[PDB]
Design a protein around this nucleic acid. Structure first.
Lengths: 79, 98, 48, 99, 79
DNA sequence: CCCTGGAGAATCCCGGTGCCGAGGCCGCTCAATTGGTCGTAGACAGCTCTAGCACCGCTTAAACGCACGTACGCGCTGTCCCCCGCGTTTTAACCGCCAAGGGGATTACTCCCTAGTCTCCAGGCACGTGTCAGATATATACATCCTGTTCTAGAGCGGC
DNA sequence: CCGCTCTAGAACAGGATGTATATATCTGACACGTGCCTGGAGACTAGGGAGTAATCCCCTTGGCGGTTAAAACGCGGGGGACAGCGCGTACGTGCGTTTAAGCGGTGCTAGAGCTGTCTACGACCAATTGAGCGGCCTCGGCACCGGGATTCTCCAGGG
């Protein structure tokens, strides 16, 4: 699996900013937003990896993702 | 014969209204799914994710980025602008402490 | 005492020049006059 | 003759270097202490505060204001300015989530 | 005790800005800083009031203020 | 250049289908409920004594206020290049369908080590104190910043 | 067309005031020593929760076509970020003056530990029992599909 950081397409980043009420989006925002999302994903998934490793499990469950988000003050409801 | 030729900004505000009252997921499923596996394979190989596990990751990442974009947009009007910049995001993360 | 007393052209010498730092004071005793504060510091230094 | 007449900002930088390396408390003890009492009077009429109790509140308030001023200052250069503005603080609290 | 919000004097707010690296300080920032400080104090002290009331004590200790700041993610070292 | 009438297109109100997730029902079974019984944390009463509250000298660095001007927030201009709206053509997204096989979930046997005491003793804590690095103090000394004077380059003017 | 004088930008040196240090000396907590003494450790008893083994069924990954929604490319163009300029005001700098912050002192009591005391209270043990949830039956609210429409918005014409 390579070049998967481009999976978050420019209209997808455009649509995300539209939900946030952004009037205009620069061309350099998409590269920065991908990097910010990559950094944020690299922290939540790594925390979920330790949660999955602690349970002697090989598949990451949704409950471990919730605990990974809860410990950083970003608790998620619905899972 | 004259094309409609909408000026920039009006359809963007229309997209803002149509996507603030809606609740569908903006980021596609497999592109976000494949990004998770590539990131996770750097930490541990032969790792699997449940379908609802990625569902929790996708909504949380979108809401965090939307909230970041809200602060990013709020920085633009604060800086007498309507176009967001990569430096606007850097200021937003620094103030939040991320 | 007073507000203007100097041997040279006065600059509102109190007992110290007001509006100036403390590292300029001289406490010598000479012939001191007022002359309405050297006729209003020489009419505002010939009007700037 | 003329005084030194430092340009606007020169003494400001000297104060910046002095207070960023010295750990003395900028806010005076007694005016801050009486502010604690009048705020706590709205919650409890018969209340007392220890000397160390007011001490702990002062350092936390000073560090929070310094951290807020750091975010407020950074928004000024972000907004092509060098002077902090009340809208910059309102932006700083909202981004931090403190309204 | 009235008009104690003015105890945070103008040079005291200026000194706080200088510690934060602020070069120029506006004349309208003092009322805003006092308002922010009043709001921040009205949360921590009230939290310490409930800590003091629950501890069967009528004097606020620095130890209670430590947990009042800690529960909001602002833990203080040195008490 | 600004006000107003008409029409193109994305959006909003509405009739019909239905379907698949939400509402309702049956066991029933396992966690909620009833009664008793003690160890025990906790409310209550008296002592106290150590730290906070209130007022007082004083003195002195901190703070309010006024005069002045120059870095800077803010108002205004253009541009051009950076970003949006739309036509076209790929492109991979989603749902449609099928197995796969690691793997989550459950049950059971058993085995280690952690719950719970007895005794003690050696490391940790309260007290006491000589002491050695930090702060106050001040002439000395940096030390960079502001400003004045001079050097040299550039544009304007006049003569040949 | 060339030389001469005027003017101004800029590098450079000197003065100024707030700090960097070199002792002198105080000084006040720092760490060492001591005396305990109170909590961890050796040893022991007992039991219970997970390691491991097995099962199982279940659920995520890989793997296909289909299709139509959408990313991507490109053209037109259009409104905005920013370089730039001008105004002015309002905040930097500086001391005069005032005024309260803080150090030190004294007195009082508000009340937090501290020690008994006695007392209801909740974990635990028999005994039990009744609606929560897995599952099944039913059913209707809004997604979907269009149909129509007010209805808000831009382009063109007129004053």
């Amino acid at each position: 699996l390579r070049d998967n950081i481009q999976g978050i397409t420019k209209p997808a980043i455009r649509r995300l900013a539209r939900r946030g009420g952004v009037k205009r989006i620069s061309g350099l925002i998409y590269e920065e937003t991908r990097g910010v999302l990559k950094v944020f994903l690299e922290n939540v998934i790594r925390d979920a990896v330790t949660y999955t490793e602690h349970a002697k499990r090989k598949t990451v469950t949704a409950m471990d993702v919730v605990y990974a988000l809860k410990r950083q003050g970003r608790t998620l409801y619905g899972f | 014969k004259k094309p409609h030729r909408y000026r920039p900004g009006t359809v963007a505000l229309r997209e803002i209204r149509r996507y603030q009252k809606s609740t569908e997921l903006l980021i596609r499923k497999l592109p976000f799914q494949r990004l998770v596996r590539e990131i996770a394979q750097d930490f541990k190989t032969d790792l699997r994710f449940q379908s609802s596990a990625v569902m929790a990751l996708q909504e949380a990442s979108e809401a965090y980025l939307v909230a970041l974009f809200e602060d990013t947009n709020l920085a633009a009007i604060h800086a007498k602008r309507v176009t967001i910049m990569p430096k606007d995001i850097q200021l937003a993360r620094r103030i939040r402490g991320e | 005492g007073g507000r203007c007393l100097a041997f040279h052209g006065p600059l509102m010498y109190e007992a110290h020049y007001q509006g100036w730092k403390s590292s300029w004071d001289e406490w010598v005793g000479y012939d001191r006059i007022r002359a309405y504060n050297e006729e209003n510091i020489a009419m505002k230094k010939r009007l700037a």
